[PDB]
Amino acid sequence: KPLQVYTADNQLIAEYGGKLSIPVEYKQIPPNFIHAFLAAEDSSFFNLSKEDILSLYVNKIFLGKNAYGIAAAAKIYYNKSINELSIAQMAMIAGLPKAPSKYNPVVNPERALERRNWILGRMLQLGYISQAEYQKAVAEPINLNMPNRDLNNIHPYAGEMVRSELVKHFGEQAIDSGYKVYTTINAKRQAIAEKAVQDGLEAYDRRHGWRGAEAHDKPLSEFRAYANTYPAQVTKVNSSSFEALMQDGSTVTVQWSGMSWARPYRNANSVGAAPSRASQIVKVKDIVRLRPNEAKTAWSLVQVPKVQGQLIAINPNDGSIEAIVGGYNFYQSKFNRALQGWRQPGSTIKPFLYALALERGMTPYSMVNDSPITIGKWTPKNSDGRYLGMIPLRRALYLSRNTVSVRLLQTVGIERTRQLFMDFGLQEDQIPRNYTIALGTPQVLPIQMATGYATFANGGYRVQPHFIQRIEDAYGKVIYEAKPEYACIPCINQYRQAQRILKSSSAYDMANILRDVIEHGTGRAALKIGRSDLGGKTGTTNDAKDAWFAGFNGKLVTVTWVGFDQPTTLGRREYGGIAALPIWINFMGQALQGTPAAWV
Amino acid sequence: KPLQVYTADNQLIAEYGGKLSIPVEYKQIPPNFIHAFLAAEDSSFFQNLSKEDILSLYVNKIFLGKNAYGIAAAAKIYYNKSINELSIAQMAMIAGLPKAPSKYNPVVNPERALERRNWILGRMLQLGYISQAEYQKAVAEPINLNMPNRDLNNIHPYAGEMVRSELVKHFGEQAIDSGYKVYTTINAKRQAIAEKAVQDGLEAYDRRHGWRGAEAHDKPLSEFRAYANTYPAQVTKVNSSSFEALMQDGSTVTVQWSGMSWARPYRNANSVGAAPSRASQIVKVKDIVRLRPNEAKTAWSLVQVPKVQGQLIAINPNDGSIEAIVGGYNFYQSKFNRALQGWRQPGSTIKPFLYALALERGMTPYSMVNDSPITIGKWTPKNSDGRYLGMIPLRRALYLSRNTVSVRLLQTVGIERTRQLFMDFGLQEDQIPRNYTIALGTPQVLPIQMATGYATFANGGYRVQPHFIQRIEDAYGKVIYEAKPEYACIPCIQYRQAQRILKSSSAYDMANILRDVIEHGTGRAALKIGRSDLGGKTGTTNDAKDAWFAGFNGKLVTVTWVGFDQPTTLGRREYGGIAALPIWINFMGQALQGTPAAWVRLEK
Numbered sequence A: 001k002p003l004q005v006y007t008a009d010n011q012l013i014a015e016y017g018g019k020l021s022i023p024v025e026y027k028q029i030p031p032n033f034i035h036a037f038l039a040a041e042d043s044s045f046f047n048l049s050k051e052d053i054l055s056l057y058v059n060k061i062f063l064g065k066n067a068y069g070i071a072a073a074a075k076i077y078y079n080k081s082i083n084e085l086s087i088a089q090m091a092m093i094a095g096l097p098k099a100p101s102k103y104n105p106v107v108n109p110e111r112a113l114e115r116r117n118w119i120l121g122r123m124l125q126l127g128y129i130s131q132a133e134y135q136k137a138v139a140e141p142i143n144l145n146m147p148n149r150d151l152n153n154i155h156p157y158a159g160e161m162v163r164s165e166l167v168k169h170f171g172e173q174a175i176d177s178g179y180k181v182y183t184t185i186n187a188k189r190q191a192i193a194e195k196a197v198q199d200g201l202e203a204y205d206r207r208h209g210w211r212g213a214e215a216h217d218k219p220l221s222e223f224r225a226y227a228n229t230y231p232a233q234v235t236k237v238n239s240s241s242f243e244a245l246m247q248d249g250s251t252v253t254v255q256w257s258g259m260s261w262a263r264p265y266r267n268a269n270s271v272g273a274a275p276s277r278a279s280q281i282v283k284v285k286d287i288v289r290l291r292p293n294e295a296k297t298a299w300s301l302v303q304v305p306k307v308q309g310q311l312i313a314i315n316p317n318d319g320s321i322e323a324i325v326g327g328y329n330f331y332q333s334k335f336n337r338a339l340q341g342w343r344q345p346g347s348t349i350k351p352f353l354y355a356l357a358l359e360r361g362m363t364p365y366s367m368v369n370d371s372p373i374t375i376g377k378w379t380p381k382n383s384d385g386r387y388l389g390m391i392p393l394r395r396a397l398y399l400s401r402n403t404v405s406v407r408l409l410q411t412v413g414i415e416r417t418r419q420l421f422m423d424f425g426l427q428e429d430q431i432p433r434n435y436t437i438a439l440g441t442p443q444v445l446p447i448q449m450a451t452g453y454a455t456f457a458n459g460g461y462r463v464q465p466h467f468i469q470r471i472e473d474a475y476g477k478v479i480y481e482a483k484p485e486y487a488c489i490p491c492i493n494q495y496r497q498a499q500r501i502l503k504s505s506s507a508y509d510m511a512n513i514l515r516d517v518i519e520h521g522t523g524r525a526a527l528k529i530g531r532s533d534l535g536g537k538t539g540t541t542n543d544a545k546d547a548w549f550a551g552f553n554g555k556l557v558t559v560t561w562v563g564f565d566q567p568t569t570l571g572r573r574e575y576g577g578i579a580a581l582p583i584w585i586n587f588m589g590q591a592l593q594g595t596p597a598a599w600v
Numbered sequence B: 001k002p003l004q005v006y007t008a009d010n011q012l013i014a015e016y017g018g019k020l021s022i023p024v025e026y027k028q029i030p031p032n033f034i035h036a037f038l039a040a041e042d043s044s045f046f047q048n049l050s051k052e053d054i055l056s057l058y059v060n061k062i063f064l065g066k067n068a069y070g071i072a073a074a075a076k077i078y079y080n081k082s083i084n085e086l087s088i089a090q091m092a093m094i095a096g097l098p099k100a101p102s103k104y105n106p107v108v109n110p111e112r113a114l115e116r117r118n119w120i121l122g123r124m125l126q127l128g129y130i131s132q133a134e135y136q137k138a139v140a141e142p143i144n145l146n147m148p149n150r151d152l153n154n155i156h157p158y159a160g161e162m163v164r165s166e167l168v169k170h171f172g173e174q175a176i177d178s179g180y181k182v183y184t185t186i187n188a189k190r191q192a193i194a195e196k197a198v199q200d201g202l203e204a205y206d207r208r209h210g211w212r213g214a215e216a217h218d219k220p221l222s223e224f225r226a227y228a229n230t231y232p233a234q235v236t237k238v239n240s241s242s243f244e245a246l247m248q249d250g251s252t253v254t255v256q257w258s259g260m261s262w263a264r265p266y267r268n269a270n271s272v273g274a275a276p277s278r279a280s281q282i283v284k285v286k287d288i289v290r291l292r293p294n295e296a297k298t299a300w301s302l303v304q305v306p307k308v309q310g311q312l313i314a315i316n317p318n319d320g321s322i323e324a325i326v327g328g329y330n331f332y333q334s335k336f337n338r339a340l341q342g343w344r345q346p347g348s349t350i351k352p353f354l355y356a357l358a359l360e361r362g363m364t365p366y367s368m369v370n371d372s373p374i375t376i377g378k379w380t381p382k383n384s385d386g387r388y389l390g391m392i393p394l395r396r397a398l399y400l401s402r403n404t405v406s407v408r409l410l411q412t413v414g415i416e417r418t419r420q421l422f423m424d425f426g427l428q429e430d431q432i433p434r435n436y437t438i439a440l441g442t443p444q445v446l447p448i449q450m451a452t453g454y455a456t457f458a459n460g461g462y463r464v465q466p467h468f469i470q471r472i473e474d475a476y477g478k479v480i481y482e483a484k485p486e487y488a489c490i491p492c493i494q495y496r497q498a499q500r501i502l503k504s505s506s507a508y509d510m511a512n513i514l515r516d517v518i519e520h521g522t523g524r525a526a527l528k529i530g531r532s533d534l535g536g537k538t539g540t541t542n543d544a545k546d547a548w549f550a551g552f553n554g555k556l557v558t559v560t561w562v563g564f565d566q567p568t569t570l571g572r573r574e575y576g577g578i579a580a581l582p583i584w585i586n587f588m589g590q591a592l593q594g595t596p597a598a599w600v601r602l603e604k
């Protein structure tokens, strides 16, 4: 009965095992196991006596690592039934009750082995085991064969989100419940998101060049496969090719076409000349990552991106988390950038501010001034370093005119804007008390940005992001049913009506301005999706340390981000519209494929 | 439903509380407590509306450290409160615990706990769950832990602890969460006799060795505890014939000359100074002393908590039933049980085990043995008096503990046969050396093992196993365990028959040699009791580092020990017959009072 995680389309995706207890009948216990316990302590004053009392505890004794009883310890530590354990393994387990942490074979293997051999010696002294049985047993290593009891192989970011969030708020007891957790995750959309992120980050990586082998002269057993990349040891280097040994022991051949892409990385803004020979790319004993084609007939040299990314997709009517990708791959890093990655949103904040200007009486057609402006020592400048004068409000938004934002921020006031940023889902202590907030200086989580944009997609309401649809107990009884705040209660085909944070006119006008952003500049990239219900805003922070895209239709809000964990420039040429927008495009195109137009 | 400990008369002596869970109805939860949990984490994605709906599923089961499951168990364990009596600061403290009940525990890490708690308090203020005034009041608040003791062991502490510590040793903490009713072999009357005998006997030794000065000087009185009818006090004034001391209740008492005049100063184990002529020679101001009241709290005297330790173990020789156990001067001074854990050298108390083998193969108590000098390599064993008696009968060499005779019998008996016999008598293989020094009592033993050994003499030559559980019942009164001990004599009362480890004649003749030791020898020790069914042997290790007495009747075997935890001399004049024998005498005299003669039987 483990904690089970299901998508919204009823796919079991994860199984989280907690406290384990597999009761056994005293008669089924191997006599050597009973003797191991009987020789575990120097004195007993309850011999025969301890043997009669052991039956009361043999299925409940806590033995470390969530194991209660002898059968649970055999399963957790060795992937064995009690009858499958060696004398050394029975002695190891019998050593644990006294202190399951001081003698744990995982935490303290030397002290555990010390304890185990002490017991083995006692078994010999008591004549429970022979010198041969003793000699064989003492020689034996720890031989732990621990089965992973946390199954998360289909959609790892989704499964982990449930486990880590339940454990964060309610502790380890949350997993011991045996509950069936029914999430809001769309399995189809989750697979799209995973693939879009992986492809998009590999696209960035390939254009930035070959960064060399991940290791040289190290054991191949020390590297793990993931994101369809297989650890390989370079064994031979030719003119146009190279031979390499896999983890199965086979030798593959990478031809020129599979490595010719390898222009050397110099810096974010420079790659060396196209390689002219295999020797400029690989050395023998180098550890490379390879990827086969669909057939497994050809292999190419690939690279795991150093850059990171994320994707978060929510339903704008209720805040349902439809797809979540926290990084390039869950094995690489368990950290979920959609929920834990604090970054500056850049110009993706501008729609929040421009909505306040619409709220206070302006329209998308209202004339605004794109001119120089100074506030103390601060002289905000546009990306292009040019000024356009009197332009309509919408031109200022689709062209990210910094001076206009700062001017609107003067007109509307910092406090009204900070209060508005909060109502859109941002954090009080993360929003500065100055005029730089108009440019997107606050620290945000991509999930908060999706919360914000949902307001445009749903008619001006604040929704709350949620991942649980319902929880059932092991016996199929519904014990929790999500009661989300709805923007539009009639749209569902009752309960909690979401608060209106913008006038309908303001969410509507902003949604149309954002659709214009897509039907012009970025834009010319996004309109490659043959759909007329899409709106969005690109963003780039100072020196391209972040590339963002936040966009929607009336049924789905997606926020994509690309950047390095330790903030570095992505490269001169790498605006939001270039690095993040492609991921957003592949996701939205496939996610929305075969659904009618859905607008505000 | 806690682990309950009962004596052999069905009287409750101890209660050990395990995992606690006091389920409450979500509606009964103060809204501020819900808000504390709601502000415990920075973000929630299940404002904080959905966490509020999901909290009902976990609010009674969340593990919150120190065996507390659910909010009501944490309120009870940490503060001795109901959820509704908790302050905003106490609700914030508890709400901080689920994430890591060890990293944020207020008992283990009060600094990291308070840091966490105030972080939550700040969040509650930011979210508008509490006001600036509620906030200010709450942050100002200390941890204020008021933890109720859930381990009640106030009647016979060494007995109660024996059950808890032994169950936890063999089966872990899960043994106490069982709600089980443990029916022990402990005789309540005999347990009280043993406790008193030990306390009195150790105080007798202590008083004759002199005043060793105050327990501490210039230390906080809150750091000291009352036990063994001794109360810690701080000297506040020093007069000519009297002094003033501040008690832990805040009262100031006066100790008159009669209550301190006994205080001859301790010079060393073998010397005490002259009788004090003034209160200033005994106490200083800020000195931490021990005071005792008489019948009624009208007068107080200066007492001293012994540095010396002791123990008493009493078993039934027919089945090994543990009737009385005292592990030290007092359980509240040291939780260590010297009867079960105190490894010491038995000295001359081992001699009857060796001399029984000589009788077994088949010498008699009258057989002539040689008390002359002996050398084995570089080792030259010498007798206590440093003199030799020549050819003497076996019984005289045993009574007089003639080391040379023991060593000589050890060659006649052989090391391995003796080591086997010692192991057969209840001793540990790895604790018995492989040399001729074992004849002198060099192995490391537990007093319980010595009682196991001596039971063999009392029961006719059978090996019994010491046991403390008679039966175990579950919380619903169902019997889940019923002790099936090995019996020396089944008609004397499954039934299980104990193995014979000695000829009846050898057990019978040794028991009679041991009776003569107490009756004709040891300055008429049985004539101090007034019984004819007692046998026993005194023991003293090198430099009086240990004082032992092992003795019996056909129905009770008692072993007493006196010595210092860090082995030091008890004094030149401090043999077994001096230190341990008086405790053994008070216990046996009272324990056996009004029971007919009970001696060993000879089955030839």
Ligand SMILES: *C(=O)[C@H](CNC(=O)NS(=O)(=O)n1nc(-c2cc(O)c(O)cn2)n(C[C@@H](O)CO)c1=O)NC(=O)/C(=N\OC(C)(C)C(=O)[O-])c1csc(N)n1
Pocket: A344, A345, A346, A347, A348, A382, A383, A384, A400, A402, A439, A440, A441, A521, A522, A537, A538, A539, A540, A541, A542, A543, A544, A575, A576, A577, A578
């Ligand atoms: C807002 O983000 C503001 C400057 N604006 C943008 O970079 N806006 S964008 O919407 O991200 N965006 N602009 C462009 C673009 C296109 C061009 O042709 C030229 O010449 C210039 N910019 N693109 C590319 C696509 O449209 C494809 O053509 C966009 O995606 N940002 C700032 O104020 C901050 N940094 O700005 C830098 C990067 C220095 C800049 O202006 O270049 C900023 C805000 S908060 C913070 N830490 N930094």
Ligand SMILES: *C(=O)[C@H](CNC(=O)NS(=O)(=O)n1nc(-c2cc(O)c(O)cn2)n(C[C@@H](O)CO)c1=O)NC(=O)/C(=N\OC(C)(C)C(=O)[O-])c1csc(N)n1
Pocket: B345, B346, B347, B348, B349, B382, B383, B384, B385, B400, B401, B403, B440, B441, B442, B522, B523, B537, B538, B539, B540, B541, B542, B543, B544, B575, B576, B577, B578
């Ligand atoms: C045995 O323990 C052995 C020497 N024998 C004893 O000490 N026997 S006794 O039974 O403990 N015991 N002896 C005496 C006694 C009385 C005297 O008048 C004189 O002169 C000497 N001894 N008493 C007095 C009582 O009858 C008064 O009521 C006894 O109780 N011990 C040893 O072999 C060890 N050390 O030897 C010395 C230091 C010489 C010693 O015992 O004094 C020894 C054995 S194991 C170890 N670590 N040391």
